[PDB]
């Protein structure tokens with residue numbers, strides 16, 4: 161048969177071979193029409209039925225076929241495809257509607273917005289006979305203003321001069337180079353060089369695009385998807401002005417505010433994907449103890465049966481019909497991977513170490529699965545609590561990671577509870593302390609259905625917010641802090657747990673990119689942020705990178721090392737101080753990890769106290785210079801310097817071969833963290849940088 165889907169697979173940054181490009185066809189511009197066949201074909205044509213004119217296009221093959229209409233007429237039409245199979249059948253497709261759109265400056269909708277930066281007659285509305293699909297409007301920016309926000313960004317702090325968008329996506333590595341993110345938000349601050357700021361927030365969970373004075377040097381062009389249903393269009397844009405802090409506080413009053421968190425999150429977090437037995441985990445924690453490199457949290461990713469992510473690997477149990485297990489349901493073989501998971505967790509607690517288990521918001525449907533995971537899958541579908549296609553059947557994951565997996569519907573209390581009830585015994589009976597809530601970026605499709613009544617145009621970006629929320633609520637209901645550790649999010653994510661910057665190679669550019677990610681994330685109210693120090697993917701980082709990154713990571717909100725799955729191949733890829741020391745032949749890295757973990761522990765009361773202040777003030781912890789020094793033009797030339805709380809100015813060393821490093825100190829008296837040497841502000845200062853030093857300066861208080 162012939163397959164044609166007007167929007168295609170709806171990969172946000174890519175197009176399939178069976179769609180219209182553009183997906184919302186535009187009168188005047190060109191229209192590319194693709195379709196696929198399930199068997200081989202010698203020929204295919206596209207018939208287009210306008211009122212008085214018929215046209216037939218000989219499509220060219222890329223089993224994909226394609227043609228294009230160079231200048232699209234402004235009339236409603238219909239189209240269908242005719243293919244000739246190699247065996248001589250003529251196949252014919254369904255009938256499809258073509259309703260070309262145009263931009264009009266007529267008051268089709270209303271943009272509800274205050275403040276004097278809105279351009280009164282900039283609104284353009286993309287309209288057809290089907291309705292109103294997108295709006296395009298503008299805000300003016302002045303020659304001394306800088307733009308920071310749009311969530312976690314990996315390319316640069318100041319977004320002025322760039323074209324970007326805000327859609328949840330998984331960009332596997334090089335997020336900076338590709339200009340994408342796991343955690344965007346349709347919000348930004350605009351900060352001038354006299355200390356005053358304004359901000360804006362497009363109140364939607366639909367996709368938004370921004371041209372931040374790239375095309376028009378004094379205009380921020382905003383484009384907003386109005387969505388599948390296409391209803392009289394009203395777009396609400398919240399706005400604030402005052403100090404940079406007033407503006408971020410504005411947004412948090414709407415979006416949500418960070419939670420209180422227990423002090424144990426500020427110790428070193430140990431992680432490695434190939435710690436996949438109880439003995440591998442304990443071997444590493446005993447090594448931490450014996451080396452004097454204290455760890456406060458261990459993350460176990462490869463803990464489960466790798467089918468349902470609810471049961472420890474090799475656990476034995478009576479089969480359930482998909483209802484939740486309790487802890488006494490399980491017997492653990494002595495010679496299995498996890499002989500006594502409750503015993504591991506108890507012992508680790510007795511040592512002061514908390515345990516976190518990886519989770520994914522996907523239910524595998526491989527044909528390899530055992531009976532328990534199939535039953536768990538059928539029970540999820542049977543509950544109704546599954547994201548659905550327009551036809552009502554379950555959404556099958558369109559990615560190549562976990563292909564065709566189901567996606568639990570976490571849009572309602574009942575669906576979140578259904579999903580997390582399967583995991584409750586882990587918290588209540590085995591006593592885990594939290595979850596690495598990975599993923600959430602898998603929902604592609606404008607026309608998907610959620611139980612809250614949203615379609616995919618609004619629900620898909622909202623998914624990771626609901627997802628982190630789900631597990632937080634599980635943990636609260638079990639008497640524990642909502643320590644979730646997530647990589648994706650949206651407006652609302654501020655209130656739900658901790659965040660890390662995702663997947664990167666072990667490179668200097670990724671180190672730089674990660675700093676930028678933490679600062680930008682802080683600037684949109686993601687307070688509890690971390691990253692995989694020195695990178696998690698590929699060969700172990702070179703010694704110099706690990707040294708510089710470990711140092712930097714000591715002065716960031718969440719400090720952890722992690723390593724990617726590598727099939728248990730050789731050499732070992734752990735980012736442990738000892739493995740990186742052995743692979744690099746630099747035994748000194750173990751001492752250095754001792755040194756900086758001692759600094760980390762001494763830093764913990766400051767991290768606790770400054771976090772508490774951040775909750776009241778609204779200011780980030782990992783804090784861009786403009787929050788306290790926006791009246792100093794010179795801060796913008798040093799965008800990878802940042803404040804850690806009110807008192808410390810941090811400047812990581814991000815270049816190999818560096819023996820000195822230069823820092824810009826803002827106005828005031830400053831004190832070298834390591835030597836006590838006093839410098840006066842308003843000046844550049846230079847520091848020797850042995851690997852035991854990262855430039856850090858403390859404000860000099862009154863005597």
Ligand SMILES: OC[C@H]1O[C@H](OC[C@H]2O[C@H](O)[C@H](O)[C@@H](O)[C@@H]2O)[C@H](O)[C@@H](O)[C@@H]1O
Pocket residue numbers: 433461462463466518598647662663722723724725
């Ligand atoms: O064993 C659990 C799980 O491990 C790997 O995935 C973990 C990986 O997922 C994302 O990429 C995160 O961003 C990383 O930090 C994590 O290490 C395997 O790929 C997966 O198949 C397996 O189920």
Ligand SMILES: [Ca+2]
Pocket residue numbers: 478479480489
């Ligand atoms: Ca049972």
Ligand SMILES: [Ca+2]
Pocket residue numbers: 510
């Ligand atoms: Ca005790």
Ligand SMILES: [Ca+2]
Pocket residue numbers: 527528
């Ligand atoms: Ca198979």
